[PDB]
Amino acid sequence: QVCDVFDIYAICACCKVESNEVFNNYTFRGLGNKGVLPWKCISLDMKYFRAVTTYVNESKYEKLKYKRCKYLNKKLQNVVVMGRTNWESIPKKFKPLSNRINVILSRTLKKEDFDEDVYIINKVEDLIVLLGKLNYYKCFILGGSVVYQEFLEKKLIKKIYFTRINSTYECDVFFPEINENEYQIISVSDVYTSNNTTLDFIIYKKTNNDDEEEDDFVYFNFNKEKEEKNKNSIHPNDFQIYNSLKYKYHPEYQYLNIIYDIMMNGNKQSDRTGVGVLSKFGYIMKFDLSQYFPLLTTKKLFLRGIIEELLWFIRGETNGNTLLNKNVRIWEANGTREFLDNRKLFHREVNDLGPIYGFQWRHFGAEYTNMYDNYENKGVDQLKNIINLIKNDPTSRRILLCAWNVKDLDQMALPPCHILCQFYVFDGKLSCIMYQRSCDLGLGVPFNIASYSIFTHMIAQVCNLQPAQFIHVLGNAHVYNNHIDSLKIQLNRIPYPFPTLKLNPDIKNIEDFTISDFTIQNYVHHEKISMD
Amino acid sequence: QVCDVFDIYAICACCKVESNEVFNNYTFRGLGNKGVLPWKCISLDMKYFRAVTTYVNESKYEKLKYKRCKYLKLQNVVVMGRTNWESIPKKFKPLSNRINVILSRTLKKEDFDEDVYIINKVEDLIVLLGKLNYYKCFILGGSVVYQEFLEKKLIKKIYFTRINSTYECDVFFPEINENEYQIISVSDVYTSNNTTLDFIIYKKTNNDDEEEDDFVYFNFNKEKEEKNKNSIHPNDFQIYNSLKYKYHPEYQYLNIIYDIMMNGNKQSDRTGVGVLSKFGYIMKFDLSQYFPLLTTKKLFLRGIIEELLWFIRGETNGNTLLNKNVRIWEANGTREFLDNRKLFHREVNDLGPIYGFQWRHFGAEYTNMYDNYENKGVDQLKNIINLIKNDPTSRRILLCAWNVKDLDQMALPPCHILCQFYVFDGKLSCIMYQRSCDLGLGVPFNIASYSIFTHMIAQVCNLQPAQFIHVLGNAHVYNNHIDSLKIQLNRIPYPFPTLKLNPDIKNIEDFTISDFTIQNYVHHEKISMDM
Ligand SMILES: NC(=O)C1=CN([C@@H]2O[C@H](COP(=O)(O)OP(=O)(O)OC[C@H]3O[C@@H](n4cnc5c(N)ncnc54)[C@H](OP(=O)(O)O)[C@@H]3O)[C@@H](O)[C@H]2O)C=CC1
Ligand SMILES: NC(=O)C1=CN([C@@H]2O[C@H](COP(=O)(O)OP(=O)(O)OC[C@H]3O[C@@H](n4cnc5c(N)ncnc54)[C@H](OP(=O)(O)O)[C@@H]3O)[C@@H](O)[C@H]2O)C=CC1
Ligand SMILES: CC1(C)N=C(N)N=C(N)N1OCCCN(Cc1ccccc1)c1ccc(Cl)cc1
Ligand SMILES: CC1(C)N=C(N)N=C(N)N1OCCCN(Cc1ccccc1)c1ccc(Cl)cc1
Ligand SMILES: O=c1ccn([C@H]2C[C@H](O)[C@@H](COP(=O)(O)O)O2)c(=O)[nH]1
Ligand SMILES: O=c1ccn([C@H]2C[C@H](O)[C@@H](COP(=O)(O)O)O2)c(=O)[nH]1
């Protein structure tokens, strides 16, 4: 087909347009405004644009030339193709585009109307003629909307390098609705921040609808048991989309790939109640908090409850009623008469959760009495101490906050799942490890990622640091049997660019945050999944 | 040369021989004994030798069809000396799916078995390959055949199995000329028929590709050569960098050292000492397949085994160790060091409520290293053992030394924060979270300690040890270890040893130093980590 021989790709960038919100991939569709771009600079998009439209590989040229010659019977650079208004949006000092063979479609304008060193063509068949005559690597359609429309309805695009700008702007022109039958996404990049917006890079593909060391690889894999056994009784063919992607570089896939790993390779166990899980042991996930807030996109997540849990912890509280009166039910089941009695806490009042996270963070080692006691200057204020070590001894390898008080375990409603946070400071940035002994991949983890990411931002702010990495170590990583079906749905979804977290900048002590100091901007997500 | 053109390869397997001793590649030489192999059956090698000698690639034969004939079902060639031929029994003859050559100057094709081949002098092969259609030519020994093939530089690659046990031998492999061949791949380590083994690859020295440009675009925001912050010199690790396949588990430790040296943050800890630092790693070692005692330098375990026994007894008394010449904690018990920790009222070598005390007495008011603490505080060690036996699917099997109440009273706060255990199908795994990781001195020992512990816990619980999982928090190279580790990165690991515990010990409290034995430890020379 014409676009496979001449290697004609589209590259574009689309913001969200000003229209319980439904999100699909038509969410990213805004192209330009009043004949320019809807944003000022997004330098990372330019850097990427520059990299795709200028990259050439001379070794691959020999096969492209042959291929092209065969379909015709018979310093290397790429061609870029522009609508006239696209071309007129470009600052003069940057035209023609350096190190690229510039082509401009126009009727109003002819060869004579240009000083530059550009090919002017009347019409699309004129690009195909030209490409049969030029030595060039790849041909990229640079827009705008009219050029994009005509190139897709002529089935002349092999791939779309589509940048998702995860902010909203005023737009007067739009990228056409991509037909899912015609194009599927095969690759999704890492998520970055540039110019106060997150973005990622996705690739749509035209649909179906020394090399002795090649061999040493196979010799060296001689003992591998699983040769399509169905190790666990989940069917790869149900993860069609998940498996069809080639480059899964969105950080959400750090979480998604562990659910794949647990499902394909998990050990079958009957846990605390008889419920049943697949389980694995030891994983690490790293999220770049300077580039995004890793709220999972492949299902809807509300953070009001877990933000109010984090503030409850920081205040040192163990009173389950405080959450209940803010309509947060996170701890309700763990405070019942029955639940407490079955934990042999017969002398513990309903919703008095005992010496849990808050108590240990502000008072580790004090004798716990009841949820209403004044524990001032009793036991160790770990939280205060770790803020003090970040500020005054940032290179310490001893900045840990530990919830696992061995003496108090049996007196807690339940022993903590988030065992400990360690902190690390280099060059004015704060990174955090949280070690989780016990990890519900379907229900718990996605919230836990959020709690500790928010907490790291908070500790960074009050210490006058920027956040860097939030690092999540999973000990006992389990998927409950009755989550599996929901999880196979979620895995076949393709993540959206992460949102961002904004903390009220004025809060300077860790104690001084409230619910209104927390804003999640630009949360684009698939619909909610009931995991059960 | 003949060899690089015609793809002439040697597959062999060499054990150690029955000769404070020193190791090199020529440690592994034993080939045969009394016209048979020196060992009963090592079936993971039998399997390897099958997969390697059968397998062929249709696609890639093209670049050979026109190269050996640009010089003058597609099976594989195997050559063997008659005694290597008759050394094997009959049901296997002639090795299925393989052009069975033999190197005999005596008995001809009418003498011998099936519809195979023969030659009579070394040269007489040179042209036989030039005739028939074949993927690659494998020399299966024996010593005599290998010997005369390495003399005449006809061997492109050697596919050499290191059998890491000792056997009676009569025949050996040639010393591999270190300047004439170099190792370019090393496999995972495996247990098989009560011995560890790995597979290494020697080479002759010289003195849908659209989705491939998408990879370059996704790397658009990565980093070049002033980026990759290196006053380290990559070219100083030629051997580390020349390996294609680095599958030996020691590479889990080595790769972290390379990562820290190359991408490490320069920081100036306490003193002005200087480190390169990163945050958050996870290594995993299969205790069922080997004992992960680093082989790229010499490690001693008596001291760290005594330390472990000392922990299990609940001791905090530094003198107990000093009287056994284990001096791991000596610096942390001086009047000077205690005074600088603001512990002016602590006896010298009274290390305070450290590992032992937290493991057997968590929450007990520490008094001094001589007090009787029986049935005071939480015996976590007894508890986590009773959890493994009574409730193995529990996700609460944690052994934690980081008592926040007691940190200031400790000579120093622990590096090893906690162990977590996991039991599946009668097998025990252990995660240890290390807050502070000296990759050059500490970590090598810390792996051995907690590997040993895992074996101890597993055995007193009648489980097989599975994985030790080492999670590193603040991982640092001391700046002055850099020269030594560069030397260390350029050493090819040896197949790991094994650990044998005295099987009689079924109480964690009942181990003594003589119940621990390391077997077949083959290691490069000791390295002083500075100077
Ligand atoms: N976000 C992004 O990735 C991109 C955004 N943009 C934005 O897009 C907008 C411009 O798009 P839009 O207004 O649709 O216009 P275009 O940039 O697509 O240019 C349209 C003009 O191109 C010429 N033309 C197009 N097709 C043909 C053809 N087949 N034969 C001959 N001439 C042809 C005509 O020029 P003439 O009128 O002289 O005959 C036509 O008026 C701006 O806002 C721009 O900044 C630009 C590209 C990429
Ligand atoms: N561990 C390992 O990797 C392996 C080692 N072995 C072991 O090795 C031992 C046998 O090896 P080894 O003693 O070296 O004997 P070989 O198996 O190497 O057989 C060599 C024979 O080939 C003939 N021959 C030797 N040199 C030449 C030559 N230049 N030209 C032509 N023919 C020649 C001779 O047979 P003749 O003159 O009688 O015709 C000679 O006896 C056994 O213990 C066996 O189990 C076996 C397989 C692999
Ligand atoms: C730049 C942009 C939006 N990014 C992607 N990913 N895909 C595109 N097609 N893009 O538009 C390219 C249009 C050309 N352009 C339009 C432009 C750029 C800046 C300001 C106004 C208009 C430009 C100008 C200068 C240089 Cl050096 C390179 C490209
Ligand atoms: C088997 C061995 C040692 N494996 C490696 N890695 N390197 C070699 N070249 N080997 O030599 C194999 C030669 C003969 N042999 C070894 C043998 C077997 C039984 C008793 C003595 C020797 C054999 C028998 C059956 C089969 Cl299917 C394949 C090889
Ligand atoms: O913050 C939390 C709290 C709980 N859990 C899950 C993990 C287990 O499924 C269960 C805890 O049960 P135990 O591991 O304590 O038995 O709750 C989480 O994932 N995150
Ligand atoms: O078992 C141990 C004890 C110490 N260290 C290293 C880490 C640091 O270099 C130093 C401990 O000092 P702090 O991290 O507590 O400052 O020793 C280890 O790697 N392992």
CA atoms of B479 and B488, how far apart (whole Å): 15
A13, β-bridge pairs:
A163
| Annotated catalytic residue, options A3, A171, A417, A463 | A417
Q: Which of A401, A383, A283 is nearest to B402 (CA)?
A: A401
Helix axes A445-462, A304-314, angle to 10 degrees: 50
The encoded tokens of residue B451 equal 């590997």
Helix (H, G, I), strand (E, B), or coil: what is residue A156? coil
Cα-flanking dihedrals φ and ψ of residue A71, to 5°? -75, -15
Burial B290-324 (b: 16+ CB within 10 A, else e): bbbbbbbbebebeebbbbbbbbbebbbbbebbeee
**A278 - beta bridge partners?**
A268, A479
Q: Which two tokens stand for residue A220?
A: 């060296």
- Report which secondary-structure segment, H or E, holds A257: helix A252-265
Q: Cα–Cα distance between B412 and B405 in angstroms, integer?
A: 13
Q: How far is the CA of B6 from the centre of ligand 4 (A)?
A: 23
Q: Where does A48-138 show beta strands of DSSP type E?
A: 79-83, 101-105, 119-121
Would you say B196 and B190 are in contact if contact means Cβ atoms under 8 Å apart?
Answer: yes
Straight-line distance from the first to the last Cα atom of chain B, in angstroms, rounded to the nearest whole number: 43
CB A361 within 8 A of CB A403: yes
Contact B451, B498 (CB under 8 A): no
Identify the CA nearest to A177 among candidates A194, A160, A193.
Answer: A160
Pocket of ligand 3 contains residue A152 by CB under 6 Å: no
Nearest CA to B200 out of B152, B151, B247, B144 is that of: B247
Pairing of strands A429-440, A466-480: parallel
For residues B427 and B392, give the distance between their C-alpha atoms in angstroms, rounded to a whole number: 10
Residues with Cβ within 8 Å of A490's Cβ and at least 6 positions away in sequence, in order, are A256, A259, A298, A299, A526, A529
What is the B388 CA–ligand 3 centroid distance (Å)? 62
Two tokens at B522?
Answer: 């083959």
Whole-number Cα distances in Å, B61 to A212, A424, B70, B159, B209: 11, 53, 13, 20, 21
Rounded to the nearest angstrom, the minimum Cα separation between A3 and chain B is: 13
> Facing residues of B14 across strands?
B162
Backbone angles phi, psi at B26, to 5 degrees: -65, -5
What counts of helices (H) and strands (E) characterise chain A? Answer: 16, 19
Pocket test for ligand 5, best of A271, A280, A438, A445 (most atoms within 8 A of CB): A438
Among chain B residues, the shortest Cα distance to A281 is held by B422
Do you find a cis peptide bond into B274, omega within 30 degrees of 0? no
Q: Is B312 helix (H, G, I), strand (E, B) or coil?
A: helix
Task: Quote the CA–CA distance of A108 and A86 in Å, as a whole number.
Answer: 14
**Whole-angstrom distance, CA of residue A486 vs CA of residue A530:** 7
φ and ψ of B245, to 5 deg? -115, 115
Distance (Å, rounded) from C-alpha B392 to C-alpha B398? Answer: 12
- How remote is the C-alpha of A149 from its chain's centroid? 30
Q: Which amino acid is at B151?
A: E
Residues near B369 by beta carbon (within 8 Å), at least 6 away in sequence: B315, B316, B317, B318, B347, B349, B350, B351
Q: Do B193 and B253 meet the contact criterion of CB atoms below 8 Å apart?
A: no
Nearest-CB residue to A475 (from B378, B420, B474): B420
Strand bridging mode A8-17 / A28-32 = antiparallel
Determine how β-strand B245-246 pairs with β-strand B195-204. Answer: unpaired
Which residues have C-beta within 8 Å of that of residue A519, sequence separation ≥ 6? A501, A502
How distant, in Å, are the alpha carbons of A82, A173, A201 from that of A11?
Answer: 11, 16, 10
If you measure from the C-alpha of residue A182 to the centroid of ligand 1, how many angstroms do you get, rounded to a whole number?
Answer: 23
Tell me how far CA of residue B2 lies from CA of A390, A460, B9, B201, B252, in angstroms: 65, 65, 12, 20, 38
H or E segment to which residue B241 belongs: helix B238-242
Question: Do residues A469 and B280 make contact, with C-beta atoms less than 8 angstroms apart?
Answer: yes
Report DSSP state, residue A73: -
Q: Are strands A400-402 and A418-426 parallel, antiparallel or unpaired?
A: antiparallel
CB contact under 8 A, A55 and B431: no
* Any ligand 3 atom below 6 A from CB of A97: yes
B415 catalytic, yes or no? yes
Residues 6+ apart with CB under 8 A from A361: A313, A314, A316, A382, A383, A401, A403
Terminal C-alpha separation, chain A: 47
Question: Which residues of A line the annotated binding site?
Answer: 13, 31, 33, 35-36, 84-86, 106-108, 123, 144-147, 150, 272, 397-398, 417-418, 436-438, 440, 448, 478, 480
Experimental method: X-ray
d(CA B38, CA B36): 7
DSSP structural state of residue B36: B
Q: What is the number of residues in chain A?
A: 532
Q: What does the block give as tokens for B261?
A: 């040296």
Which two three-digit tokens encode residue B512? 């003594």
Residues 6 or more apart whose CB falls under 8 angstroms from that of B243 comprise B183, B184, B185, B186, B492
Give the Å distance between the CA of B432 and the centre of ligand 6: 14
Q: How many C-beta atoms lie closer than 10 Å to residue B345's C-beta? A: 8
* Residue in this structure with the two tokens 């529990």, named with its chain if needed: B394
R_g of chain B computed on alpha carbons = 28
* DSSP structure class, residue B485: H
Instruction: Name the DSSP letter for residue B393.
Output: T
Q: What kind and span of H or E run contains B519?
A: strand B516-519
**DSSP 8-state symbol, B218:** H
Task: Give which of A396, A437, A445, A478 to mutate to test B binding, by max B Cβ within 10 Å.
Answer: A437
Resolution of the model in angstroms: 2.6
* Residues B516, B305 contacting (CB under 8 angstroms): yes
What's the rounded Cα separation, in Å, for the pair A46 and A59? 26
Q: Which long-range contacts (CB under 8 A, 24 or more apart) does A100-104 make?
A: A100/A53, A100/A54, A101/A77, A101/A134, A101/A136, A103/A79, A103/A127, A103/A130
Nearest-angstrom CA–CA distance, A502 and A196: 11
| Ligand 3 touching residue A156 (CB < 6 A) | no
Strand ranges (E), B189-272: 190-192, 195-204, 245-246, 265-267
* Contact flag B282-A284 (C-beta cutoff 8 Å): yes
Give the side-chain half-sphere CA count within 13 A for B247.
20
Catalytic residue among B12, B14, B415, B419: B415
Closest alpha carbon to B26 in B196, B237, B169, B139 = B169
Q: What is the DSSP string of A330-371?
A: TTGGGGSHHHHHHTT-TTS-TTB--S-HHHHHHHBTS----T
Using the beta-carbon criterion (under 8 Å), do B377 and A271 form an inter-chain contact? no
> Do you know the residue count of chain B?
531
CB atoms < 10 A from the CB of B21, how many?
5
Task: Evaluate whether A266 touches A458 at the Cβ level (below 8 Å).
Answer: no
Contact A285, A475 (CB under 8 A): no
**Sequence-separated (6 or more) residues with CB below 8 Å from residue B355:** B311, B401, B414, B416
Residue A151 has phi, psi (to 5 degrees) of: -75, -35
Distance CA B455, CA B301 (A): 15
A252 vs A480: CA distance, rounded Å: 20
Strands (E), A91-221: 101-105, 119-121, 139-141, 159-169, 173-174, 183-194, 197-206
Count Cβ atoms below 10 Å from residue A233 Cβ, excluding itself. 8
Single-letter residue type at B48: Y
Per DSSP, which regions of B231-326 are E strands?
Answer: 245-246, 265-267, 275-286
User: Which amino acid appears at position B326 of this protein?
Assistant: V
